[PDB]
């Protein structure tokens, strides 16, 4: 086989605190003894994922993450298993979820909204260029590294579209109610443009402090999405409002940035992004949130 480092094993690490608990996974900070490097190790119990029919999501996460090579994504460095567990060695995003910052500060100023929006747009341009739909983009899945650059995660519900068939639509029903696109609800398929709908909701949330479609329960949220039933608060940055209006469009072929709208060029050219230097965002110093 191709030359590669020795496969790792649990005894190669000292495990420390739990960083997160999921319904079928747990993430633990670990130090690799031989290097002193720190990883976030996602651990899944084989019996549990077998019983709860989660193996396809686990295999999907490994397959999609292994294809990514870009600074705005959590990195999958290695995987291994033992008799009871599967292990993913991921980069550790020390500053946690973007959602945490929205909640603490209430909403972002225009400079920070623009910067973080531009990072997300650049990450989506990369993903869509590889024919990958995220399908569950939301602030909880946009992590922040030590330098406050984004690290998008949660690829177990992502989809690699088939280049051989020029596949544009994916059929699995996945996502989170507040960010799900109208085409997934009504046509039961998603496309790359479904991520641009989620982007619109995220920009709105950064400025307004709440996602645009919101209610106590999921069904009520769905009813608002399909009617495009939302409003802006009064002081919303005007160019950001124009951008959100060009993303939160019911017809998935009419969202700025989608292929039918001639792609990322026109989206990056939107007036909200006038000052952005798109070429090397990950090398730029992020603006301070407070
Ligand atoms: C190492 C974890 C357990 C893996 C394994 O070895 N197994 C379970 C299983 C389940 C689902 C899949 C799967 C993966 C991707 C896409 C679809 C599916 C799937 N498979 N069925 N429905 N969806 C693979 C393995 C055996 C088997 O089922 O082969 C059992 C006997 C323990
Ligand atoms: C409907 C597919 C059902 C499963 C199956 O049958 N497949 C895929 C697969 C993927 C992943 C695993 C897996 C997941 C977690 C941990 C270990 C494993 C694993 N992988 N190998 N052994 N265990 C298992 C099966 C065959 C194969 O893998 O070839 C298809 C492609 C014919
Ligand atoms: C049962 C191990 C032999 C199967 C094997 O070798 N492969 C399939 C594979 C690999 C890794 C996983 C996996 C998924 C989630 C978490 C950990 C692991 C894991 N298990 N062991 N290490 N990582 C599932 C299936 C290779 C590959 O598809 O990459 C082939 C191409 C050589």
Numbering used by the authors: 70 to 359
Recite the paper's sentences.
Phosphoinositide-dependent protein kinase 1 (PDK1) is a master kinase that phosphorylates at least 23 AGC kinases at the activation loop, a site required for their activity. A linker connects the phosphoinositide-binding PH domain to the catalytic domain, which contains a docking site for substrates called the PIF pocket. PDK1 does not require binding to PIP3 to phosphorylate substrates such as S6K and SGK in vitro or in vivo. These phosphorylation events are mediated by a phosphorylation-dependent docking interaction between a C-terminal hydrophobic motif (HM) present in substrates and a regulatory site called the PIF-binding pocket (PIF pocket) in PDK1 (18, 24–33) (top). Here, we used a chemical biology approach to show that PDK1 existed in equilibrium between at least three distinct conformations with differing substrate specificities.
The angiotensin II type 1 receptor blocker valsartan inhibited PDK1 dimerization (IC50= 32 μM). Des(oxopentyl) valsartan did not disrupt PDK1 dimers, suggesting that the oxopentyl moiety was important for the interaction and disruption of PDK1 dimers. The effect of valsartan on WT PDK11-556 but not PDK11-556 [L155E] suggested that valsartan binds to the PIF pocket as well. In agreement with this prediction, valsartan but not des(oxypentyl)valsartan inhibited the interaction between His-PDK11-556 and biotin-PIFtide. To further understand the binding mode of valsartan, we crystallized PDK150-359 in complex with valsartan. We solved the high resolution structure of the PDK1-valsartan complex, which showed that valsartan binds to the PIF pocket of PDK1. Three molecules of valsartan produced a strong electron density at the PIF pocket and were modeled. Therefore, valsartan molecule #1, located on the helix α-B side of the PIF-pocket, could be responsible for disrupting PDK1 dimers. In such a model, valsartan molecule #1, which interacted with the helix α-B but also extended outwards, could act as a glue between the catalytic domain and the linker-PH domain to stabilize this conformation. Although PDK1 could bind HYG8 and PIFtide simultaneously, valsartan did not further enhance the temperature stability of the PDK1-HYG8 complex. These results are consistent with valsartan stabilizing a monomeric form of full-length PDK1 that is distinct from the monomeric form stabilized by HYG8 and functionally different because it does not bind PIFtide.
